[PDB]
Structure 1
């Protein structure tokens, strides 16, 4: 069952064995992935998060981010530790009380403390639209049509060297999959369809690192949503999905009744499908209960290419149709050396006082804010352009901006910008050497918004900056509840920190 929009959510430690290997984890709702949180567009969500964690090897503090939800007027509820809050300590709870005006689509939630979401705190978050313009394109859209793609590690996250190339031990599809080494024939996930029906498959990358080449043997996929943004219909036979991205696609159950492999090939870790790694099963009602015998093609003839995507609505692009054609045009210098990432010459290390609390206490320019050199102010009611030229080791890096979606004016592997009708999204691959992936948005949401690579190991190694958007209006726009004001005193007391 789905939970929400008003619900408790308990965060616990437990042993799980999603690939046949038992390890302890950090779980929401007792499962991996966590339960789906859901509601309708414009609803009030009140997710009371109970921190019941006791195992220090995965951190007993926590904080949860609602990925892709804009949090307008509720920056304090966004979740990134030391940007918008101090962590919740064990034995305490916190009500994330916010609204989702003007958004409908496929989202997710995850820990946003250190690398803790890798240890298991990740689940889907769906905001349905009762008047969805795409409703007539499918018959079925429910908890059974959500497909999560996850990397899973046998080593606990707090034992991963910072700045290292860290590699997973299994791909999990809907929480199940097989290990790359010492492979055992543990259970595979089954997605069940009825011949003749059309399904809104909600594909969610809950990855901490790899991108996946996703396909379904014998089937194609008609994209209708990208990171929350309705798209024109685009039919493809493969989707390369980077960490934290989402797509809705229509699956037409139009092939013979049978069993078909669902494939998710990561860019690192196990390559191929030997022993049923990187796999799940599409089963038609009436098919025999047995593994598929289908083949992938050698090459995919209609792969997703990001510049082929266009919004369903006339979203356009803000600003002027050339590089630098914005009120505030920025170019970030994105680098890696010696185990640490940097942006504009500064490696991100979380501050002691959350950025939002520094601003509410009266710090009102970006040079007064800590960490020094990690906070860039943005002016209000202005068109922002951010060029993100690739080259830093460990790519391709999927950059994500909180508080906003953005027009993708230039995509990976294509030097031509689009100032007319690019897709809008919230997490974008910045590509390869020589690329110049560029995003645009307008500043109508006061508060400090994190910008970072969504490979969680890279964020931990410093690949982040904070956009302090409209510092002068942050306090009036974001009134804070007493429970939020209580978080830093409690956290600092528990950890013997003075501030």
Structure 2
């Protein structure tokens, strides 16, 4: 069952064996992935998070981010540790109480402390639309049509060297899959469909690092949503999905009753499908209970290309139709050396006092804010352009902005910008050497918003900056509850920190 929009959520330690290998984890709701949190557009969510963690090897503090939800007027509920809150300590709870006006789509939730989400705290978050403009394109849309793609590690995250090329041990589809080495025939996930029906498949990357080449043998996929943004229909036979992205696609169950492989090939880790790695099963009702015998093509003839996507609504692009044609045009210098990433010459290291609390305490320019050099102010009610030229080691890097979605004016692997009708989204691959992926948005949401690579190992190694959007209006726009004001005193007392 789905939970929410008003619910408790307990965060616990437990042993799990999703690929046949047992290890301890950090779990929401006792499962990997965690339960789906759901509601309708405009609902009030109140997710009371109970931190019941006791194993220090995965950290006993926690904080949860609601990925892709704008948090307008509720910046304090966004979740990134040391940007919008101090962590919740063990034995305590915290009500993330916010609203979702003007958003409907496929999202997710995850720990936003260190690399803790890699240790298991990740799950889907769906905001349904009772008047969805795409409703007539499918018959079924429910918890059974969510498809999660996850990397899974046998080594615990706090034992992964910082800045290293860290590689997974299994791909998990809906929480199950097989290990790349010492492979055992452990159970594969089954997605069941009825011949003749059409399904809204909600594809969620909960990855900490790899991108996946996702396909379904014998089937094609008609994209209708990108990171929460309704799209024109685009039919493809393969989707390359980067960490933290989401797509909805229509699956037409129009092939002969049978069993078909679902494939998710990561860019690192095990290559291919030997022993049923990187795989799950699409089973039609009435098919024999047996593994598929289907083949992938040698090449995919209609792969997703990001410039082919266009919004369903007339969203346009803010600003003027040329590079630098914005009120505040920025170009970030994105670099890596010696195990650490940097943005504009500064490697991100979380501050002792969360950025939001520094601003509420009266620091009101970005040079007054800590970490020094890691906070850029943005002016209010202005068009912002951010160019993100690639080249830093460890690519392709999927950059994500909190508090906002954005027009993708230039995409990976294509030098031509689009100032007319590009897709809007919240996480974007910045591509390869010589690319100049560029995003635009307007500043109508006061508060400190994280911008970072969503490869969690890279964030840990410093690949982040904070956009302090409309510092002067942050306090009036974001009144804070007492329980939020209590978090930093409690955290600092528990950890013997003076501030």
Question: Residues 413-444 of structure 1: CA distance to partner in whole angstroms, max 9, x if unpaired?
Answer: 00000000000000000000000000000000
Question: Residues 355-379 of structure 1: CA distance to partner in whole angstroms, max 9, x if unpaired?
Answer: 0000000000000000000000000
Distance 2:480 2:53 in 1: 26
Q: Secondary structure at the match of 2:394?
A: coil
Distance 1:351 1:432 in 2: 31
Question: Residues 113-132 of structure 1: CA distance to partner in whole angstroms, max 9, x if unpaired?
Answer: 00000000000000000000
Distance 1:421 1:364 in 2: 36
The answer to whether the aligner puts 1:451 opposite 2:454 as a matched pair is no
Shift of 1:401: 0.0
Q: Secondary structure at the match of 1:225?
A: strand
Q: In structure 2, what is the equivalent of residue 2 of structure 1?
A: 2
Distance 2:471 2:88 in 1: 25
Shift of 1:302: 0.0
Question: Residues 22-54 of structure 1: CA distance to partner in whole angstroms, max 9, x if unpaired?
Answer: 000000000000000000000000000000000
Shift of 1:63: 0.0
Distance 2:407 2:319 in 1: 11
Q: In structure 2, what is the equivalent of residue 368 of structure 1?
A: 368
Shift of 1:446: 0.0
Distance 2:325 2:264 in 1: 39
Q: Secondary structure at the match of 2:244?
A: coil
Distance 1:161 1:433 in 2: 25
For this pair of structures, how many residues does the alignment match?
499
Q: Secondary structure at the match of 2:81?
A: coil
Q: In structure 2, what is the equivalent of residue 238 of structure 1?
A: 238
Distance 1:67 1:58 in 2: 21
Shift of 1:86: 0.0
Q: Secondary structure at the match of 1:287?
A: coil
Question: Residues 88-137 of structure 1: CA distance to partner in whole angstroms, max 9, x if unpaired?
Answer: 00000000000000000000000000000000000000000000000000
Q: Secondary structure at the match of 2:474?
A: helix
Distance 1:116 1:431 in 2: 26
Distance 2:85 2:285 in 1: 48
Distance 2:155 2:442 in 1: 41
Shift of 1:148: 0.0
- Give TM-score, length-normalised by structure 1: 1.00
Q: In structure 1, what is the equivalent of residue 378 of structure 2?
A: 378
Question: Residues 259-306 of structure 1: CA distance to partner in whole angstroms, max 9, x if unpaired?
Answer: 000000000000000000000000000000000000000000000000
Distance 1:354 1:307 in 2: 37
Question: Residues 206-246 of structure 1: CA distance to partner in whole angstroms, max 9, x if unpaired?
Answer: 00000000000000000000000000000000000000000
Shift of 1:472: 0.0
Q: Secondary structure at the match of 1:493?
A: helix
Once the two structures are superposed, the pairs formed by residues 199-348 of structure 1 within 5 Å of their partners are 199-348=199-348
Q: Secondary structure at the match of 1:180?
A: coil
Shift of 1:201: 0.0
Q: Secondary structure at the match of 2:39?
A: strand
Distance 1:405 1:489 in 2: 33
Q: Secondary structure at the match of 1:76?
A: helix
Structure 1 runs not aligned, ≥5 long? none
Distance 1:486 1:133 in 2: 43
Question: Residues 321-363 of structure 1: CA distance to partner in whole angstroms, max 9, x if unpaired?
Answer: 0000000000000000000000000000000000000000000
Q: Secondary structure at the match of 1:356?
A: helix
Distance 1:227 1:466 in 2: 21
Question: Residues 368-403 of structure 1: CA distance to partner in whole angstroms, max 9, x if unpaired?
Answer: 000000000000000000000000000000000000
Distance 1:333 1:114 in 2: 23
Shift of 1:173: 0.0
Distance 1:55 1:149 in 2: 26
Shift of 1:10: 0.0
Q: In structure 2, what is the equivalent of residue 54 of structure 1?
A: 54
Question: Residues 128-168 of structure 1: CA distance to partner in whole angstroms, max 9, x if unpaired?
Answer: 00000000000000000000000000000000000000000
Q: In structure 1, what is the equivalent of residue 28 of structure 2?
A: 28
Distance 2:418 2:382 in 1: 20
Shift of 1:75: 0.0
Distance 1:364 1:167 in 2: 41
The answer to whether the aligner puts 1:93 opposite 2:93 as a matched pair is yes
Distance 1:363 1:488 in 2: 17
Task: Find runs of 4+ consecutive structure 1 residues off by over 3 angstroms.
Answer: none
Shift of 1:182: 0.0
Distance 1:116 1:240 in 2: 25
- Give TM-score, length-normalised by structure 2: 1.00
Structure 2 runs not aligned, ≥5 long? none
Distance 2:225 2:231 in 1: 5
Q: Secondary structure at the match of 1:248?
A: strand
What is the root-mean-square deviation of aligned Cα atoms in Å?
Answer: 0.0
Distance 2:61 2:98 in 1: 22
Q: Secondary structure at the match of 2:489?
A: helix
Q: In structure 1, what is the equivalent of residue 466 of structure 2?
A: 466
Distance 2:480 2:77 in 1: 9
Q: Secondary structure at the match of 1:325?
A: coil
Q: Secondary structure at the match of 1:158?
A: helix
